[PDB]
């Protein structure tokens, strides 16, 4: 036989074994350990915040570039956040102290290959979708 036991009377055994050997899964181990609740958004999908300052960050390995980023202060959470401002002129709209809406970039964890320690995207300025501010015929204040 193989490692696993094949008895009709040994269900219990197999059961406990699976519940145990199962902790070896990160996806499991992750949600199981209320880890999602401890991140900056507290599980949340999005978070409002105030711009603490627009800072720039350098690209990594084969890339060399000045990334646009805003240091934000989340509201009820109250944490320092590193937030990447999307497309071209974008940072030209973010005025310091305005209200911003941030969300993650591809599965909360690794930032885009290029960025260093940034885990967030900026989608709203004073409650005005960026895309909107990006295309003239849309909006501006």
């Amino acid at each position: 036989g193989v490692g696993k036991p094949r008895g009709i009377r040994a269900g219990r055994k197999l059961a406990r074994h699976r519940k145990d050997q199962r902790w070896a899964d990160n996806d499991f181990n992750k949600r199981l350990l209320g880890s999602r609740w401890r991140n900056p958004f507290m599980g949340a999908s999005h978070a409002k915040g105030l711009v603490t300052e627009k800072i720039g960050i350098e690209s990594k390995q084969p890339n060399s570039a000045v990334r646009k980023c805003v240091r934000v202060l989340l509201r009820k959470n109250s944490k320092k956040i590193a937030a990447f401002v999307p497309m071209d002129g974008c940072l030209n709209f973010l005025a310091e102290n305005d209200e911003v809406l941030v969300a993650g970039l591809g599965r909360q964890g690794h930032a885009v290959g290029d960025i260093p320690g940034v885990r967030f995207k900026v989608v709203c300025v004073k409650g005005i979708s960026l895309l909107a501010l990006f295309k003239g015929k849309k909006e501006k204040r």
Partner: protein, 78 residues
């Protein structure tokens, strides 16, 4: 005092693995003096009104039986 604990031995099925595990419920039983007890014998209880916190079963028919030692080890799908 005129109260005994009977242990029932049954199997439980496990949906996934499609197999069973062992399990035992313990039961508070009242024994009228009439029948004579002994440890490790099969007994027949009836459903009588609550007589105490646990008790809710009275002995009605006793069968003497022999188990050489551990009553705990003993597990029979009786």
């Amino acid at each position: 005092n005129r109260t005994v604990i009977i242990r029932r031995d049954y199997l439980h099925y496990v949906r996934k693995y499609n197999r069973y595990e062992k399990r035992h419920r313990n039961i508070p039983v009242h024994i009228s003096p009439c029948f004579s007890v002994k440890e490790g014998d099969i007994l027949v209880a009836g459903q009588c009104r609550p007589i105490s916190k646990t008790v809710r079963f009275n002995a009605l028919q006793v069968v003497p039986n022999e188990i050489i030692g551990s009553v705990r080890k003993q597990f029979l799908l009786f």
